[PDB]
Amino acid sequence: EELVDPLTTVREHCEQLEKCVKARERLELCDNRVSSRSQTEEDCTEELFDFLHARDHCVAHKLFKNLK
Amino acid sequence: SPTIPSRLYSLLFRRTSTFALTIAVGALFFERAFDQGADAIYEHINEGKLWKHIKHKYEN
Amino acid sequence: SDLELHPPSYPWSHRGLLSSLDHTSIRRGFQVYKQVCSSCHSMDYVAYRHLVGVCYTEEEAKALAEEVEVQDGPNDDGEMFMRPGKLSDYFPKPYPNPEAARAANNGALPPDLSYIVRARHGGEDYVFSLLTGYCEPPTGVSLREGLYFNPYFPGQAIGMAPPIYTEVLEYDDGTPATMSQVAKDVATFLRWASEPEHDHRKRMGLKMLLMMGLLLPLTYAMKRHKWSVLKSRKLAYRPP
Amino acid sequence: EFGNLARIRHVISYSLSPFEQRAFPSYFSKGIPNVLRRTRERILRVAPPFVVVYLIYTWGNQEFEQSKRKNP
Amino acid sequence: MLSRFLGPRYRELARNWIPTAGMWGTVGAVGLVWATDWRLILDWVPYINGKF
Amino acid sequence: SKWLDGFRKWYYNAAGFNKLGLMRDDTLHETEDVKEAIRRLPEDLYNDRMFRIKRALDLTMRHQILPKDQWTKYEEDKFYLEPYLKEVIRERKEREEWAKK
Amino acid sequence: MTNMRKTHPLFKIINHSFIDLPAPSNISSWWNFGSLLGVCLMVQIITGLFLAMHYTSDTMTAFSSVTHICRDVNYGWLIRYMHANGASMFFICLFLHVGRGLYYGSYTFMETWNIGVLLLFAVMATAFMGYVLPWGQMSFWGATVITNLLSAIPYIGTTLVEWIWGGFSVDKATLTRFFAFHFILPFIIAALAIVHLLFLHETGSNNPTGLNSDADKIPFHPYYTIKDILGILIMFLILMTLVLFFPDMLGDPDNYMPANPLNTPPHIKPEWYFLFAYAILRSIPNKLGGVLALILSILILALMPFLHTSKQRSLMFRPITQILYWILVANLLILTWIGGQPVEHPFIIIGQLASISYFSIILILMPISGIIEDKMLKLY
Amino acid sequence: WGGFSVDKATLTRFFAFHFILPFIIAALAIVHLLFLHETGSNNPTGLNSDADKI
Amino acid sequence: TSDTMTAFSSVTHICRDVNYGWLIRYMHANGASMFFICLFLHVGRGLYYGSYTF
Amino acid sequence: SHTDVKVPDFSDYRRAEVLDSTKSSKESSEARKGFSYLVTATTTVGVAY
């Protein structure tokens, strides 16, 4: 896209905090322990919710300043 | 030369009929002035958001 | 899943106690609904005469109504004809009945977005997080074809294809039609559609607050003035 | 039924006109100590039930958010 | 706190009022049976066996 | 022992009617037995009770209390309605046991 | 000449009731509340009358008529949200009025108390049917839940519920008869409130001390008249800041969808003035026992005159029973919080302990505390 | 009317008003009976009925 | 039902499908007529026997 | 005796214009009545609005 989405810029800025990156390695340990063919019903919904909650709280702190 | 509440009572508030007359007159003055002030304040809070602030780029 | 994700609180321009809606954003979200959202969702409780004095003049809204065609009748011969729309007409439904709505959208019925802000927890924050939260599913859960992963939807497997993207439509005023801007405009417009009385309600509330802040010390002073006979009364007891 | 409600002997009451006396005579200066006096009389009977049920509310919310976790 | 109502006079009063209260209970039972058309009772009365 | 008396005095201070100038026997909710006990009172004690109740109502209206020197102390709290009330309950029990036989 | 206020056969009632009525001088602001209730009652009636002028009781045109009131009728949103938030504020004044009656020993007026319990039952039924009336999702499913627990009654419950329904489920017959009953019930409440005031005025009103207030009595006018005007204006302040700033903080979002019998909501609950009753209901694992416990909860509130084992009327000089009273109030708050929660851990055990403590405080511990302070003050 | 003629708004408001009026009629009938019972009722001869009342 | 499309139809539903709904509706109409009969005779009796002095 | 009664001091409650016991009244009664009736009139204006 020639028109750059500001939401992607705010999101990648909000990957630079600390709670988001701690949830990022938590999601990393989750998906390589369930991607190792463990044959379980366990998925990574909780880790994705924690990371998305931290990232979206960071985004909602500073999203509407650059939007018109 | 008494105070202004003294002559205000002695000319306006002593008789009940003129008391109600000045209540009605002050009520119509107050409703006009209070609507002016309230729309002024509500206009001052909300620059650029109301329809009357933007009905010139589209009205033509 | 049993656990669910709550939408964050966004700093809306109407989020204040005395803050009004931005009518340019409501207009932009109206055309976002018109060229995108009107193909699947209905708006059974909003007419073209609800937009005058809000986002459009009577000529622009009349042209918008005369753009689309409305079935009307029957005539003297007893047949339904296809007239141009009027200001009094409601917004046109995409489907005549919910059964063809479920058939066209693979079982799922697209709901009426008239009070979709007031029917959901979070309000327009839920709509903004739903439209700008379409992400890939995590490992350990498999998604069948015809379903999409949106974590803000209950059950996290929504049946709505992702409707908005960058430059999905063109704005009349030259606003850059980014995805987040389109989502914000349509969330403002849906907030207006759920509560069309919102600006008048907040103006009436400001008038109420000023009048009651005037009235409360005055009637308190009147009550205390009448009760000061008892509040300053002194008692004495002198038996012989 | 004024005049026959009770029988009171040797009691003298003095009252002022409302127009000869202030509406708010020493309002804050003798209103604040009376408010804290009533507060000191009543909080030890009123508040600890609300403190205890705030604790129950917080513990129940914490147990509900913990009970929906993944592990184990 | 109804220990006032323990005595021979109250016992004699209650003993006198048993048959009147029993007859009034009979009237109330017959009135509730008739006004509701209960099938547990009218099917046993010989004359009323026509509506069921 | 004396601990129970001191703890009773602490509860008497915690009850709060003594800060209104009241006595214990004024705080009785008047049933028919208490009404007959008041009716049998002498005139001076009746007038003192009426003034104490009126002063307590005047203080409760203003949400105030007496100064701490004017509080009713636990020592001189004379129990004036107890013998009249005891004879009223005894006569009522006599009428009750006559009517129960 | 003569005195027209005291000798006119119509003005004599108003003079005896609101002008020259002897009232205690020391009654606090809680004594405003019942008068506010009456004002709130007529406010409801007035708003309801205008909501009866554009509403159609029919399942095809109930929700659409409500949206027509909100959008097309001039200030119809204002009158509708005034009706709903004034119902909530009516129950706020109701709970504070009943709590005043419980704390200050006003339940010794037995006929007035039982008449008030009848008024309480009538206003709860009126609010339940009125909440069914707009025909949203939560209206339909709450009506279904309440009628099913009414159908839990053995051998007459099924017949009574299919006779209340007018059919085999909740349909337009139920909606029309609920509209008729919700219309007619507030006038019965008004006549019953007239009887309530009649019994109170022939027995007199009570002071917060609980003592005989005949020594210091004042006319109702102009003290309590202006005090009730101030209370009315404060009640209007709270009602207007609820209707004009937060219209939906007490409302249910799922009521803004059209009613669907095919789709059930994930969570079904009544409004916040029914939530403690629902939590008392949900604790007992027996539906007949749950309905029995609900009706006997309101009936032990009615039975509270017969548990008075103390020589002092009010709780002003009874601090142990004051502590138990505030435990009861906090327990009611806990039951209100639990009633809006699902049946998950740890809400079942908390709700069961809350209902057990509620019944134990009302029935057992309060007369025991009264006897304890009776002994402790050397009263017996 | 609520409009230019008799229409749906007129029918709804007439249903509400027809519902509300008989209760006001009942209250006015109570006031009617009260005003009668203040002074007693009238006999067909128009005389004073205080000499013979039942 | 107080809507113009479903008023006459609701009245026919009362008279045809509701159990003894015809009895209720025609009792209501003829009771209104008998109410005005009683009202006219009440007024005329008040006029004849001089009851307007109250 | 009945001459033994004296009204207690109301100086903690009296207005600023009637504190002085050595000066006559009726030179300030109209001002106090005007203040009270002005409060009542403003309340009536707000209630009427």
Ligand SMILES: CCCCCCCCCCCCCCCCCC(=O)OC[C@H](COP(=O)(O)OCCN)OC(=O)CCCCCCCCCCCCCCCCC
């Ligand atoms: C000391 C002050 C320190 C700080 C200094 C600052 C000033 C603060 C105020 C000072 C006041 C000084 C004293 C004057 C007030 C009057 C006396 C008073 O209130 O004393 C405290 C009171 C003592 O008890 P009292 O009522 O006086 O008498 C009982 C008989 N012994 O004690 C109490 O009332 C205590 C009550 C405790 C209640 C605990 C309840 C626990 C259980 C709750 C369960 C509720 C929920 C249940 C839910 C079930 C389902 C889950």
Ligand code: HEC
């Ligand atoms: C056809 C491809 C659609 C377009 C264009 C839009 N939406 Fe949609 N949406 C669609 C369906 C089939 C459904 C049914 C529910 C499901 O299972 O997917 C929906 C649902 C919604 C909802 C409700 C979400 C909920 O939790 O109930 C909303 C709020 C919504 N859609 C918003 C929305 C907007 C704002 C649109 C314009 C950009 C839009 N949708 C377009 C299908 C389609």
Ligand code: HEM
């Ligand atoms: C006789 C007087 C009354 C009439 C005519 C009346 C009429 C109505 C009508 C027509 C509605 C549906 C309108 C709507 O909600 O969209 C309604 C709703 C309601 N009424 Fe009433 N009502 C009356 C009195 C009361 C009273 C006394 C209460 C209780 C305090 C009450 C509580 C409610 C409630 C809770 C609702 C639901 C509001 C909502 O949609 O959330 N009503 N009433």
Ligand code: HEM
């Ligand atoms: C339905 C709404 C109700 C209305 C309109 C109402 C009305 C009133 C009014 C006007 C008073 C006199 C003013 C006062 O002292 O508070 C009063 C007092 C009283 N009411 Fe109610 N009431 C209602 C509900 C109840 C209920 C549910 C009860 C029972 C718990 C009740 C019991 C009492 C008692 C005991 C008093 C006397 C208290 C006292 O004066 O000391 N009322 N009510």
Ligand code: HEM
């Ligand atoms: C709404 C319909 C009315 C009702 C329910 C009603 C009810 C009553 C009742 C119960 C009485 C006492 C019993 C009796 O004397 O017959 C009465 C008497 C009376 N009514 Fe009416 N009334 C109605 C209409 C009227 C009208 C329209 C008038 C005026 C023309 C009227 C004037 C009187 C008079 C003058 C009496 C007393 C005469 C007497 O007792 O001898 N009434 N009414």
